[PDB]
């Protein structure tokens, strides 16, 4: 499910550390 989570975060422009 990390697949969808990462996509959603990408879609929102969230900053990854």
């Amino acid at each position, epitope marked *: 499910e990390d697949n969808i989570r*990462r996509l959603r975060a990408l879609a929102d*422009g*969230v*900053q990854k*550390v």
Partner: antibody
Amino acid sequence: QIQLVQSGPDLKKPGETVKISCRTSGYAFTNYGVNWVKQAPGKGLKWMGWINTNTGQTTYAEEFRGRFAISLETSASTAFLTISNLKNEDSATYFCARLIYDGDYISSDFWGQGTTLTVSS
Amino acid sequence: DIQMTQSPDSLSASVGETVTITCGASENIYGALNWYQRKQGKSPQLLIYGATNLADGMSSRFSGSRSGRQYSLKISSLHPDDVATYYCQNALSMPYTFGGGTNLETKR
């Protein structure tokens, strides 16, 4: 130590504008998001919006899209919440929190102490 | 927008007892769920992230689980300092909406 220090409490008249500040320290400001949470008296937490501290991109919950603006002063590691045309319903305590995303999960891991706004004649 | 339904509104339990708070997501949120603890007069504190992961510096007496669209916060053994309001939060897609919150009190 990681800290988010907000500006003090304020009393405003309806129709006026308030700018609440969130001064951060203890980490690389532009590697983490900042998001704002509203808590009206006797009500729960309400997520208001987020700003990308790197790109400046913002996103708001529907309820707050109009009169609410999140902005930055990057050189001072500070974020601001500006509320325009204040209404009595805006009386609440506002929190800023650091938004961290570790590549798997997203959360508000560090919080400011809160800012209590009263709107009144 | 995702709507979070938290249950129950308030909860009372004896010390040492196990307590369970639940959250229902209006849609599948793929395990992206946070729990925050709000002690009286303090700022919310991250308690659980990713549905099941204990946040730094929080008691191991707290754990989280998931069943479909039902998320659970569990306290294995209640202590008096656990009294607080607990909030779940959608953390998948913005807006990261909170549940209505749950007031936890102690029976003594």
